[PDB]
Amino acid sequence: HHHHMSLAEFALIDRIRARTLERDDILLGIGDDAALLQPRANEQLVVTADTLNSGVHFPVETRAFDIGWKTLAVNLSDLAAMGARPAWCTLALSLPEASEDWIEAFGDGFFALADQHDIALIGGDTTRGPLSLSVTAMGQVGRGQALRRDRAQLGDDIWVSGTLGDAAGALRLWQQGALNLATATLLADYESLRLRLLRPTPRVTLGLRLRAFAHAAVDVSDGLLADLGHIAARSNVAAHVDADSLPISHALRELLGRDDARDCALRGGDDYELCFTAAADQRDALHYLAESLDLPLTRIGRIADGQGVHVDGEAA
Amino acid sequence: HHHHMSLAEFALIDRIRARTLERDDILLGIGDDAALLQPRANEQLVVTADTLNSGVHFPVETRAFDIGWKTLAVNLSDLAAMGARPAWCTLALSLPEASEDWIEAFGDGFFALADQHDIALIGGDTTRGPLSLSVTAMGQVGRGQALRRDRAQLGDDIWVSGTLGDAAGALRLWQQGALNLATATLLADYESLRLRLLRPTPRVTLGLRLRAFAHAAVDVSDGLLADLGHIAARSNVAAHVDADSLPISHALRELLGRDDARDCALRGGDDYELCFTAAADQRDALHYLAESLDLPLTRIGRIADGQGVHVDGEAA
Ligand code: NA
Ligand code: NA
Numbered sequence: 177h178h179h180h181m182s183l184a185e186f187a188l189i190d191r192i193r194a195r196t197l198e199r200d201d202i203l204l205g206i207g208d209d210a211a212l213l214q215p216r217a218n219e220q221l222v223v224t225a226d227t228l229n230s231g232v233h234f235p236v237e238t239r240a241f242d243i244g245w246k247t248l249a250v251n252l253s254d255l256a257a258m259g260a261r262p263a264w265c266t267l268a269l270s271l272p273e274a275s276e277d278w279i280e281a282f283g284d285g286f287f288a289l290a291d292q293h294d295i296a297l298i299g300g301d302t303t304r305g306p307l308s309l310s311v312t313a314m315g316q317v318g319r320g321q322a323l324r325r326d327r328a329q330l331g332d333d334i335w336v337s338g339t340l341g342d343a344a345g346a347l348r349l350w351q352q353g354a355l356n357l358a359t360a361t362l363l364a365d366y367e368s369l370r371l372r373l374l375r376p377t378p379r380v381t382l383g384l385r386l387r388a389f390a391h392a393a394v395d396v397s398d399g400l401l402a403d404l405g406h407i408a409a410r411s412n413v414a415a416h417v418d419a420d421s422l423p424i425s426h427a428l429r430e431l432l433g434r435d436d437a438r439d440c441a442l443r444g445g446d447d448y449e450l451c452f453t454a455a456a457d458q459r460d461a462l463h464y465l466a467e468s469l470d471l472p473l474t475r476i477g478r479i480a481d482g483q484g485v486h487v488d489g490e491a492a
Numbered sequence: 493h494h495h496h497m498s499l500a501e502f503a504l505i506d507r508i509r510a511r512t513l514e515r516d517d518i519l520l521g522i523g524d525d526a527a528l529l530q531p532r533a534n535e536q537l538v539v540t541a542d543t544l545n546s547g548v549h550f551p552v553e554t555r556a557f558d559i560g561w562k563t564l565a566v567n568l569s570d571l572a573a574m575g576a577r578p579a580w581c582t583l584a585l586s587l588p589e590a591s592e593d594w595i596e597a598f599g600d601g602f603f604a605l606a607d608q609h610d611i612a613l614i615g616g617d618t619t620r621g622p623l624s625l626s627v628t629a630m631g632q633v634g635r636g637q638a639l640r641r642d643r644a645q646l647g648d649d650i651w652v653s654g655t656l657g658d659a660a661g662a663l664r665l666w667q668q669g670a671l672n673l674a675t676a677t678l679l680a681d682y683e684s685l686r687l688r689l690l691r692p693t694p695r696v697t698l699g700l701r702l703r704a705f706a707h708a709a710v711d712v713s714d715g716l717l718a719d720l721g722h723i724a725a726r727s728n729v730a731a732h733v734d735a736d737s738l739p740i741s742h743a744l745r746e747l748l749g750r751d752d753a754r755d756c757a758l759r760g761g762d763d764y765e766l767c768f769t770a771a772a773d774q775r776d777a778l779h780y781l782a783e784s785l786d787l788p789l790t791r792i793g794r795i796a797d798g799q800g801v802h803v804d805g806e807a808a
Contacts, residue, residue, distance in 0.1 A: 178549045178761070179714055180542050180566070203536070207642055207726065210538050210574060212633070217533035220519070222526050223614060225582040225628065226496050229621030233494045250496070258526060266541040268584075268626045298539060301626075305545030310584045310617075310626035312541065317528070326523055398495055410523065445494070 181302040184209050187279045188297070191287055195296050202264070202296055211298040213264055219316040221263075224254040230307035235350065237358040240278045242374040243309060244285030249378045250397070251313035252293055253448040256383030257395035259323035260315030262295035268312075270305035285375075293380045321387050323452075326410035328392040332453035334415060334477035335390075335462060337379050339425040340400055342372030344444025345432050365427035372425075376448035382469060386452055389461060393452035399443035404451055405485045414482030416489070417442075423474040442487065453479050497618040500525050503595045504613070507603055511612050518580070518612055527614040529580055535632040537579075540570040546623035551666065553674040556594045558690040559625060560601030565694045566713070567629035568609055569764040572699030573711035575639035576631030578611035584628075586621035601691075609696045637703050639768075642726035644708040648769035650731060650793035651706075651778060653695050655741040656716055658688030660760025661748050681743035688741075692764035698785060702768055705777060709768035715759035720767055721801045730798030732805070733758075739790040758803065769795050 183204075186192060196204040196211060204211040215221060228247050230236050238246075248265070255262050267286070269279070279302075290297060295313065346369035349355035354366075357374065361367045386393055392411060396403045400417070408415040422441045429437055454462060459475065466473040484491040499520075502508060512520040512527060520527040531537060544563050546552050554562075564581070571578050583602070585595070595618075606613060611629065662685035665671035670682075673690065677683045702709055708727060712719045716733070724731040738757045745753055770778060775791065782789040800807040 182540070182570070209641055209722075209726075210540070210638075212638065213537040213539065215531040215533075215537060217531075221529040221531060223529065223580070223582055223628075223630075224498070224526070225584045225616045225626075227584040227586050227617050227619055227621065227624070227626060229586055229619065229624075232619070232621050254498070264539070266539055266628050268541045268543040268628075270543050270545055270624060300541045301543050303543055303545065303548070305543065305548050305624060306622040308543070308545075308586060308621060308624050308626075310541075310543060310624075312539075312582050312584075312628040314539075322526075322528065325525055406525075410525075 178304060183299050186302065187276065188283045191283060192297050196298065199296055202298060204298065213298065216316055219318055221314055221316055222258055222260050222322065223312060223314050224251050225310065225312040226250045227308060227310040235357055238374065239358055240281035241285035244282035245289050245375045247309040247311050248286055248289050249376050249448060251311050252378035252380055253395045253397065255313055255315040256378050256380045257323060257393050257450055258317065259321060259383045259387045260317045261384060262293050262313060262315045262380060264296050264298045265311055265313040267297055267300035268310040269302045270308040272307060323386055323390065323393040325392055325394050325406050328407050328411035328413050328453040328479045330413060330479060330481060331456060332391055332479040333456055333459065333475050334417065334453050334479065335473050336396065336400065336423065336449055336451045336476050337382055337471055337473055338449045339423045340396065340447050340449060341437060341440030341444040342369050342425050342428050343376060343446040344440035345369050345428045345437065346373035348436065349431065365430045368425065368427040369431065373446065376446060378448055379450045382450055382471060385465060389458050389465065390452040390454045393450055396447045396449045396451050397445065399445060400451060401442055401485050407453065408485050414480045414484055414486060415477060416480055416486045417477040419487050421474065421476045423472055494620060499615050502618065503592065504599045507599060508613050512614065515612055518614060520614065529614065532632055535634055537630055537632055538574055538576050538638065539628060539630050540567050541626065541628040542566045543624060543626040551673055554690065555674055556597035557601035560598035561605050561691045563625040563627050564602055564605050565692050565764060567627050568694035568696055569711045569713065571629055571631040572694050572696045573639060573709050573766055575637060575699045575703045576633045577700060578609050578629060578631045578696060580612050580614045581627055581629040583613055583616035584626040585618045586624040588623060639702055639706065639709040641708055641710050641722050644723050644727035644729050644769040644795045646729060646795060646797060647772060648707055648795040649772055649775065649791050650733065650769050650795065651789050652712065652716065652739065652765055652767045652792050653698055653787055653789055654765045655739045656712065656763050656765060657753060657756030657760040658685050658741050658744050659692060659762040660756035661685050661744045661753065662689035664752065665747065681746045684741065684743040685747065689762065692762060694764055695766045698766055698787060701781060705774050705781065706768040706770045709766055712763045712765045712767050713761065715761060716767060717758055717801050723769065724801050730796045730800055730802060731793060732796055732802045733793040735803050737790065737792045739788055
């Protein structure tokens with residue numbers, strides 16, 4: 177055994193081709209074993225890759241649709257933080273056993289998210305092994321248009337999209353035995369947290385607009401403090417966070433205690449939100465942008481002389 | 493846990509940067525979290541992806557250097573069969589435990605092969621999980637220059653590079669208890685087979701020249717019959733193989749019986765040779781090419797009216 181199945185053999189090939197037929201930058205005919213891709217000549221390519229392993233990056237009971245969604249969402253969130261326009265991706269699936277129905281359901285979730293951001297699956301592998309999903313996503317950026325982590329400026333405001341800590345809250349409730357991840361619950365606050373863990377929303381549209389407003393950006397996937405820490409270190413500045421200002425969802429505040437909710441918001445994994453810095457005179461414009469996107473953008477802190485990320489004045 | 497480590501955090505980042513510094517199509521500075529890639533404007537990109545899983549695609553005792561070599565070799569062999577020029581790749585490593593020395597040795601093998609074909613590692617992931625290595629390789633082709641599986645012509649000769657069945661022979665000897673894969677042996681024929689399994693040679697240089705000579709091509713990784721089968725099916729022709737003509741190495745003939753060696757050559761996994769078809773009047777030129785490349789090219793059969801791959805006249 178150990179055969180590698182590339183394109184044409186993919187269980188998803190019909191849905192793959194349906195999407196390449198409507199893309200003038202992808203040549204993939206019925207009788208084609210690999211796609212020919214046409215980059216934009218004056219743009220640059222950026223490439224991200226992430227592997228999600230069963231039991232590590234998702235609880236084993238996570239359903240196929242949610243695995244398909246989240247595997248792509250991680251990569252799209254990476255591309256968002258660079259302000260890159262998603263173009264193409266590959267998918268390398270390791271499965272212990274053939275399961276036609278599982279792959280179809282995985283494809284449901286993958287394409288549900290992929291279609292929203294016009295990223296086209298154009299190749300990959302299906303082979304035997306412990307359940308592991310590796311996605312490589314390719315995006316494009318105009319010259320000098322990429323967002324970076326090293327360009328925060330003294331006096332900048334710090335901003336973050338969406339809400340922080342929901343996924344960590346769902347994970348904690350699941351570990352305490354209070355939340356089933358494999359089925360939908362009618363209890364609205366639990367279901368909200370469940371879907372923030374299972375189906376994070378990559379802020380691609382925001383990322384594509386931030387170049388016009390922001391100085392530096394990072395995606396928040398290892399917790400706000402860790403990821404803002406990359407901005408502070410790469411930019412050679414201090415970052416100050418006002419913990420009271422953090423955007424905390426209704427459900428997180430309702431279902432977790434004050435301290436646990438705060439810890440989730442500051443240090444929780446897997447938010448897949450965007451944290452960025454902007455000149456103070458962008459405040460009006462960023463509030464307008466949040467309304468335009470129907471996406472919360474919350475001013476949470478400031479960039480200042482010194483080093484390290486601070487919470488309420490303390491960097492220790 | 494479950495953190496994803498991308499570029500800048502890679503244990504291999506110093507060797508990565510040493511190689512991007514000498515590539516004018518890759519922008520990756522010391523203070524850069526992701527590379528910007530510049531495609532050739534008039535060329536098309538093709539992308540391949542393969543995952544190798546411990547115990548599945550390589551015996552668990554395979555050493556780190558050989559895992560690094562073979563993981564890339566699979567992808568380069570895919571690119572070779574398309575006549576694509578390798579450009580860039582990503583590497584997504586799942587490791588059960590941090591091991592600095594293992595990753596360094598893996599990098600030795602990866603870069604040993606990558607440097608020979610001027611393919612640059614430009615990103616990827618390192619994360620926790622059962623040992624699994626997923627590589628995405630990006631190559632480029634001029635307009636209409638890609639080799640294809642569907643263009644064999646009636647009357648073509650069938651050709652194959654190198655030798656067939658060595659890797660399968662080593663695997664059989666290992667399964668019978670006669671070959672240790674984790675250490676070098678001084679016994680020359682065993683060592684030859686061992687390295688054909690552990691370190692296959694992707695025929696990239698051949699692939700880049702075949703467009704000038706060949707009609708159709710495929711890489712042989714699931715055995716000659718399976719892979720030539722793709723040419724026959726996609727081209728709507730019969731392929732006839734003369735089994736007596738197959739290139740069988742000294743070591744394979746010496747260490748396996750006549751029947752086992754024949755079965756390895758016809759159906760053995762993991763040769764990573766190239767099988768192609770060419771007009772009969774290319775015979776002189778292809779012998780000259782083999783001399784030029786110091787690479788055996790062996791005429792093994794013919795394309796004819798009918799369907800399916802035949803051995804000594806039989807397609808059953
Ligand atoms: Na198309
Ligand atoms: Na360079």
